[PDB]
Design a protein around this ligand. Structure first.
Ligand SMILES: *[C@@H]1O[C@H](CO)[C@@H](O)[C@H](O)[C@H]1NC(C)=O
Length: 398
């Protein structure tokens, strides 16, 4: 959409780059909200209205084609991110799902490089990503996410999309959702926005989930028809890793009875271990809390391969069929090697109550407990803070 007259003022965030040799050294990065989370409105004389709702093509009256859409729909800068529940303090990024005044901004943001015109492209195959988190205000049904998508580095900046990454354009993930704009261009044909994504962290105070999601395309792929569906080009389910799902129930939770105690801050390490040919083999998640390394659990379930890391053997046996079919662990790793964008978000789920994350087979949460109507009766103001985001040499971030 066309950038408007209001200026964009991105939050600055200090992150780190790590080596065994020099340790963690500070870096400047900026934060940007999703393009379609910016105010979008019609050009002067075209009246009231936006330019389409999530899940739809843009309106045919203002967006009969890409060129018209580029002129007729205006995207405004955000001069004050705190209005969207987004703030930074030094190395800390706070995402508020609900504001005191009742607004539910449910922010999703990306990491911009220091120039503010390209996303910071992380290449994590053979490397580790680490961050500190405070999950105390995330009850059942809430999802703090920190994850990677193979978005285009300039947000596919182009003639009709001049805003680019500076305005948060170019979002995609393994779900192939239809958005009214894709790569900053009117989605006239109503395609889905598909790409490989590595869900490093989808979690609340009750459960913690890690999942690669493969697509059989490189980059952002606009899918049509069945390509967007379950047997299509992306892995909607991902290869899910969650202690509760492998019959370990005392690893992560609210209280001293859990190895990771989500009433207190902790550190989340994710290692992307590559084989002798440089291909991704295994994904290893452990934690650190009160200065103690908390090692990954091992699986403990009849019919589930014995392992303490995600790999092809586990994924296959736990029925991650499209993950294997669409390129398996090696395929995830090719994406990561090409370069990925970091996204961080806080959301909830009106349709399904985030049950896949923390209910039944996946956690201690009751039926109904994660509905949005119940969340606000448990924690009125859900929020998460990620701090000291840092990546680099295996063994160097903690
Ligand atoms: C779950 O783990 C327990 C040990 O805590 C074991 O007794 C039980 O048989 C396991 N369940 C399955 C189905 O593997």
């Amino acid at each position: 959409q066309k950038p408007g007259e209001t200026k964009e003022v991105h939050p600055q965030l200090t992150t780190f780059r790590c080596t065994k040799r020099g340790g963690c050294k500070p870096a400047t990065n900026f934060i940007v909200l999703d393009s379609l989370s910016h105010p979008i409105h019609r050009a002067e004389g075209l009246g009231p209205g936006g330019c389409g709702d999530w899940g739809n093509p843009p309106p045919k009256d203002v967006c009969p084609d890409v060129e018209s859409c580029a002129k007729n729909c205006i995207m405004e800068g955000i001069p004050d991110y705190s209005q969207y529940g987004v703030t930074t303090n030094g190395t800390s990024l706070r995402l508020q799902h609900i504001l005191p005044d009742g607004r539910v901004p449910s922010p999703r943001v990306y990491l911009l490089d220091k120039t503010k015109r390209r996303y910071e492209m992380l290449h994590l195959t053979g490397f580790e990503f680490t961050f500190d988190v405070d999950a105390t205000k995330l009850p059942c049904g809430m999802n703090s996410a920190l994850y990677l998508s193979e978005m285009h580095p300039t947000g596919a900046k182009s003639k009709y999309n001049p805003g680019g990454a500076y305005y948060g354009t170019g979002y995609c993930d393994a779900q192939c959702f239809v958005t009214p704009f894709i790569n900053g261009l009117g989605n006239i044909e109503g395609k889905g926005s598909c790409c490989n994504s590595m869900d490093i962290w989808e979690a609340n105070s009750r459960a913690s989930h890690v999942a690669p999601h493969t697509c059989n395309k490189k980059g952002l792929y606009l899918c049509e028809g069945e390509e967007c569906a379950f047997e299509g080009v992306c892995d909607k389910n991902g290869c899910g890793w969650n202690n509760y799902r492998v019959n370990v129930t005392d690893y992560y939770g609210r209280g001293e009875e859990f190895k990771v105690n989500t009433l207190k801050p902790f550190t989340v390490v994710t290692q992307f271990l590559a084989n002798r040919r440089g291909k991704l083999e295994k994904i290893h998640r452990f934690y650190v809390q009160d200065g103690k390394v908390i090692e990954s659990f091992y699986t403990n379930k009849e019919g589930v391969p014995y392992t303490n890391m995600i790999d092809d053997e586990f994924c296959e046996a736990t029925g991650s069929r499209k993950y294997m079919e669409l390129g398996a662990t090696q395929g995830m790793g090719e994406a990561l090697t090409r370069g990925m964008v970091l996204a961080m978000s806080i959301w909830w789920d009106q349709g399904g109550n985030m049950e896949w994350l923390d209910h039944g087979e996946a956690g201690p949460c009751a039926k109904g407990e994660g509905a949005p109507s119940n969340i606000v009766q448990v924690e009125p103001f859900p929020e998460v803070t990620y701090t000291n985001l840092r990546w680099g040499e295996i063994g160097s971030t903690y």
